[PDB]
Amino acid sequence: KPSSVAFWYAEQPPLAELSQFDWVVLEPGHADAADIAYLKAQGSTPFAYLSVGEFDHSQVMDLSSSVWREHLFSRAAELRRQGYAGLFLDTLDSFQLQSEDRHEPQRQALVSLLAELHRREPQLSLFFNRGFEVLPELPGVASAVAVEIHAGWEAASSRYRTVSQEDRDWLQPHLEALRAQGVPLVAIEYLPPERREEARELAARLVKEGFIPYVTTPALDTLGVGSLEVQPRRIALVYDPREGELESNPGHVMLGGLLEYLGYRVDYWPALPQRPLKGLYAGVVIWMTSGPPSASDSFHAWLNARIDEQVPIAFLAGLPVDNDGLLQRLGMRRLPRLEFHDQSLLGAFEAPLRLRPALTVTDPQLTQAALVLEHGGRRYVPVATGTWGGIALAPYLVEEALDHRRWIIDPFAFIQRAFALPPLPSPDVTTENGRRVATVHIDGDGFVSRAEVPGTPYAGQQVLEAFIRPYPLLTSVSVVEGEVGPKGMYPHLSKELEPIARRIFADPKVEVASHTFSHPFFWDMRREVVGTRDYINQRLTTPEKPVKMIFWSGDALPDAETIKLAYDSGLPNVNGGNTMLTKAYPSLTGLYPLIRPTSGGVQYYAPIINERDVLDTFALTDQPRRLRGLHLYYHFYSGTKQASIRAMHQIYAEMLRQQPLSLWMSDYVRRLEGLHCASLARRADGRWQLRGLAGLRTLRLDPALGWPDLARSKGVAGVRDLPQGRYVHLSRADALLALRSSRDPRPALEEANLPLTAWEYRSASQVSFSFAGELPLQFSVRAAGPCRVTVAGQSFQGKEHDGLWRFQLPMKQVRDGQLVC
């Protein structure tokens, strides 16, 4: 029996958010096979809309007609074959539009139609929309019945209308009876997107009245409020393609990574979506500096639609608005000495405020200036916020110089203020089981180069002996077929080079990746993606250790079709961007995003760029905010010179001093997948519900939300309260996070060196747990009394240090260990 239900009849269903709901009704034809399978993998049950009484300007069909009956029976079979778990049966009372003479005939034809559909397809759950005239003769057939109770939509007048008490009285006996037969009742209510607080109240009311509510819009094209409410965890970033493609837009390059860090999926848009963003987007960033698009009327309409639904909008850098009425709605108008500024928003973050846009505030009730400059006696306002969002216009956004930029606004404070962002458990990929994450991946370039060392071995052997073998970090290694293979550019060296590659790929700390055939410096694509995959799999490694990833060469900006080709070939991908921060130039403007979404799929940028700059980037992305894990990225050419070799050894040493949790790049990318896809929802019992996390298992909990409540959580193992964040550790993707205002004194995981695969409280003092990785397990527990772990008939007493109980077990995996304190 369902605990929550959502309806989405539009294209581009937001899959992770909808998967928060037990049942999801879709419009088949606006959804594809991949959509259905994703919902199911997340635990949701997908239903398909099917109109029974009418054909779609509708045609009331003859329910006794053999052509129509068999059409619907056929459609049911197809939809089942396509993966739907049920049907949402609509227009079940449309027969009453006929003459009273034909009413009983058609009713009886409908009872038999539905009985026969049920008989033929017993595996399909049948979710009726009303049907009160036929349900009494279909006992046990309906899994649920919907009713469109308090807030309705009147299609004839195109308006939202309170439901008459007369209408409820008519419904009341029918619903009473259904409740007595144990049939779930789904109340489908309609409120405009801006009246979201009312929707929350109505949903709570309908639950107490015994319904499963879903409060939405008449087009069913919004993420509505149900018995749970999805937390808007996306931010949109709109750019002007005339000014450049996404990958060079300054908002993507300088802000995308900060929005990811703050806790959000970032969707990038150059036709803008013509549906409500309310309930799905926490805000919209606009970063356009050449004015409105040529289709300016539609653009202005779109902006006004967000204002009207109260989705906040932040205009950064430029103000692409040629519409005084729009500006008037925001209390602004088009029209140097410093008259005023809000130092919480600018001037105290990186760059100081230095004097160097014809825009002012007309209504301080609507817009609060953060910066007021006076020139020629007029007051200009280039930075401001209000309930509608904000503006932060050049040259008071970023200080710019050739090769260097610094923030003038505090970007975090501005976005938080403009969008009124609430505190979140933010998905976080920098830290796992309380430890900073470490990856090491190697581009194959220079494998064939000879090291400037005695013996002049190949760079491939040098990296194997100097770096891979001596250090205990899992490493993801690529080669270029154009270097090492018979069909490449060194066909007579392949006989000496392939054996080295085979030895590397056979090391137990190594996983295999491809670095293409010809190492394109600037992106035959099937030859580069598929052919070198096949070359490596066949000649350099075994069936049990295949290529796991493609590492892009060169500028690492393939097109959408190439990315899709890589996915179609079983190869997740990594590289690109230019995340680099140095003590010389430590501005956070140097942080790229992790994620580059395309129509061909997601490209993951290199978390930290390749080849002192790197040791600095590690430190500046660790503190005061931990923006990145320890991500060592280099080329085989780095093993050709004593000085590069010396530098490498110093990087490895700093990484190991931090005692990270080591991951292969292919496993790390499943964490980044969660970064991109995660959804958060707030249940009525107050717990946070998670979907779409994939391999991600850390939430950075905003201290305003308190501490994990380990009595009421599911899949939450502990917390580590560090300067950079309150890291909550998850033992599964479908976790439920209960919160309390004080730290839970029951035994909690503090840190561990291996991935965590289970953690369940048997009691306030006993935990069953499981870990699996590549090193002997080390972990520590925060608890009062002494702690002991029993595994496979053996007991280990915890060693105490400063409130923690530390454990070192001589095993790389633990299945259902027992912790008692």
List the one residue out of 735, 702, 734 whose CA is nearest residue 716. 735
169, two tokens:
């009285």
Three-class SS state of 239: strand
Name the architecture of domain 428-670.
Alpha-Beta Barrel (3.20)
CATH class name, domain 232-422: alpha beta
C-alpha span between 448 and 481 (Å, rounded): 11
Can you count the helices (H) and strands (E) in the chain? 19, 53
Same fold for the pair 232-422 and 428-670 = no
How far is the first Cα of the chain from the last one, in angstroms, to the nearest whole number? 39
Peptide bond into 395 cis (omega under 30): yes
Contact in structure between 681 and 691 (CB atoms under 8 Å): yes
Angle between helices 66-81 and 100-120 (to 10 degrees): 30
Three-class SS state of 465: helix
Alpha-carbon distances, residue 731 vs 154, 654, 695, 808 (angstroms):
47, 29, 10, 19
Identify how the structure was determined: X-ray
Query: What is the distance of C-alpha 107 from the center of its chain?
Result: 47
C-alpha span between 76 and 86 (Å, rounded): 9
Q: Give the resolution in Å.
A: 2.1
CATH class name, domain 5-229: alpha beta
C-alpha span between 251 and 266 (Å, rounded): 11
The string of DSSP codes covering 130-142 is --TTTGGGSTTT-
| CA atoms within 13 A of residue 133's CA, in its CB half-sphere | 16
Angle at 388 between CA 382 and CA 391, to 5 degrees: 20
Residue spans per domain, the chain: 5-229, 232-422, 428-670, 671-820
Angle at 148 between CA 146 and CA 152, to 5 degrees: 160
Cβ–Cβ contacts within 10 Å for residue 297, how many? 10
Considering only the C-alpha atoms of the chain, give the largest distance between any 2 of them, rounded to a whole number of Å. 102
List the one residue out of 300, 290, 319 whose CA is nearest residue 396. 319
List the one residue out of 443, 442, 439, 462 whose CA is nearest residue 451. 462
Q: Which amino acid is it at 539?
A: R
